[PDB]
Enzyme design. Structure first.
Site, short mmCIF file in Angstrom:
data_model
loop_
_atom_site.label_atom_id
_atom_site.label_comp_id
_atom_site.label_asym_id
_atom_site.label_seq_id
_atom_site.Cartn_x
_atom_site.Cartn_y
_atom_site.Cartn_z
N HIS A 1 0.94 -1.10 -0.01
CA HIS A 1 0.10 -0.01 0.02
C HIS A 1 0.73 1.34 0.11
CE1 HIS A 1 -0.07 0.34 4.54
NE2 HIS A 1 0.19 1.61 4.28
N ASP B 1 -0.95 -7.14 1.63
CA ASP B 1 -0.04 -6.00 1.90
C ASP B 1 1.21 -6.25 2.04
OD1 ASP B 1 0.20 -3.07 1.83
OD2 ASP B 1 -0.54 -2.96 3.69
N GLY C 1 2.96 6.14 8.90
CA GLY C 1 4.22 6.25 8.64
C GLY C 1 5.01 5.17 9.42
N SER D 1 4.02 1.89 8.51
CA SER D 1 3.32 0.79 7.44
C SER D 1 4.93 0.41 6.78
CB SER D 1 2.70 1.21 6.60
OG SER D 1 1.51 1.84 7.14
N1 LIG Z 1 -1.73 0.31 14.08
C1 LIG Z 1 -2.84 1.13 13.90
N2 LIG Z 1 -3.87 1.38 14.81
N3 LIG Z 1 -2.90 1.75 12.93
C2 LIG Z 1 -2.06 1.45 11.80
O1 LIG Z 1 -1.07 0.67 12.00
C3 LIG Z 1 -1.94 2.50 10.84
N4 LIG Z 1 -2.71 3.46 10.99
C4 LIG Z 1 -3.23 4.50 10.18
C5 LIG Z 1 -3.61 5.70 10.76
C6 LIG Z 1 -3.55 6.96 11.16
C7 LIG Z 1 -4.59 7.68 11.64
C8 LIG Z 1 -5.59 6.63 11.49
O2 LIG Z 1 -5.14 5.54 10.96
C9 LIG Z 1 -2.19 4.51 9.14
N5 LIG Z 1 -2.22 5.56 7.79
C10 LIG Z 1 -2.98 6.60 7.96
C11 LIG Z 1 -4.49 6.16 7.22
C12 LIG Z 1 -4.11 6.08 5.81
C13 LIG Z 1 -3.86 4.72 5.31
C14 LIG Z 1 -2.25 4.40 5.57
C15 LIG Z 1 -1.74 5.26 6.51
N6 LIG Z 1 -1.59 3.60 8.78
C16 LIG Z 1 -1.34 2.51 9.73
N7 LIG Z 1 -0.34 1.47 9.38
#
Ligand SMILES: N=C(N)NC(=O)c1nc(-c2ccco2)c(N2CCCCCC2)nc1N
Length: 246
Positions: free
Chosen positions: A46, A97, A196, A198
């Site tokens: 992603h 992913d 960030g 990810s």
């Molecule tokens: N461990 C967790 N609870 N969450 C995550 O791992 C995680 N969360 C978010 C996120 C931030 C704010 C709300 O959700 C996020 N994003 C922001 C959204 C757009 C898609 C990918 C990037 N990426 C992630 N990997």
């Protein structure tokens, strides 16, 4: 990483920092990854799907800071960007992913191990830790969900593996979570991965060995009660990894 602690690259020396160049030539942070062999970094599809040209990416190893150089670091171009053909995006979940980046220097070299750069072993197939096991995550992702900036210093924290049974409950993620994903969370929901982070490593001890059990993938918000971190279940992708790295 929400909560946890600051760290340096010596405590996660397989951690790769991935950045993207712009037509402007501004260069900005994209996602983490993990070095699985000298020439190969594993990450999340992603992170790259909207911008899938390999020439667009820069990969650092041995890097502890986001916008300044770490002594000993190595910088690489992306020779091959391999995204998983069965990837898909729901409202929230990302399926399959997982992504592979083949790395090569301007000089044609892969990574050379050192005190700040080492590979992380893959798990054995279909061999994960028991639920409730404590594992660690690492990243330059947000420290609070509402932060505009990413932290300058690498961070890490500890989360506990959640059973599929529990993670599939509707007040958790229902159907969104599949057998190819792992859930992990803090019992107080006080620490977690975030935007960030990810692509980065979920590392667990199994055998006597630090093992790449998971790749940071998604979650509904961050450090939010009843909404675990969801991770790609590396031990369900070994044939895909090997096929694309032989
Ligand atoms: N461990 C967790 N609870 N969450 C995550 O791992 C995680 N969360 C978010 C996120 C931030 C704010 C709300 O959700 C996020 N994003 C922001 C959204 C757009 C898609 C990918 C990037 N990426 C992630 N990997």
């Amino acid at each position: 990483i929400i909560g946890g602690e600051f760290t340096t690259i010596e405590n996660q020396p397989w951690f790769a920092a991935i950045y993207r160049r712009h037509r402007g030539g501004s260069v900005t942070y994209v996602c983490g990854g993990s070095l699985i062999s000298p020439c190969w970094v594993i990450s999340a599809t992603h992170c790259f799907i909207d911008y899938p040209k390999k020439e667009d990416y820069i990969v650092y190893l041995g890097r502890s800071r986001l916008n300044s150089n770490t002594q000993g670091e190595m910088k690489f171009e992306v020779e091959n960007l391999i995204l998983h053909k069965d990837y898909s995006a729901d409202t929230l979940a990302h399926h399959n992913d997982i992504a592979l980046l083949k790395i090569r220097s301007k000089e044609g070299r892969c990574a050379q191990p050192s005190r700040t750069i080492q590979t992380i072993a893959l798990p054995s197939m279909y061999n994960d830790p028991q639920f409730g096991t404590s594992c660690e995550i690492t990243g330059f992702g947000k420290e609070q969900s509402t932060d505009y900036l990413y932290p300058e210093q690498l961070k890490m924290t500890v989360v506990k593996l959640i059973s599929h049974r529990e993670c599939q409950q509707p007040h958790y993620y229902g159907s969104e979570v599949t057998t190819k994903m792992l859930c992990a969370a803090d019992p107080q929901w006080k620490t977690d991965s975030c935007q960030g982070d990810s692509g980065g490593p979920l590392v667990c001890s199994l055998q006597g060995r630090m093992t790449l059990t998971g790749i940071v993938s998604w979650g509904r918000g961050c450090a939010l009660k009843d909404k675990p971190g969801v991770y790609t279940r590396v031990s369900h992708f070994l044939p895909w990894i090997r096929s694309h790295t032989k």
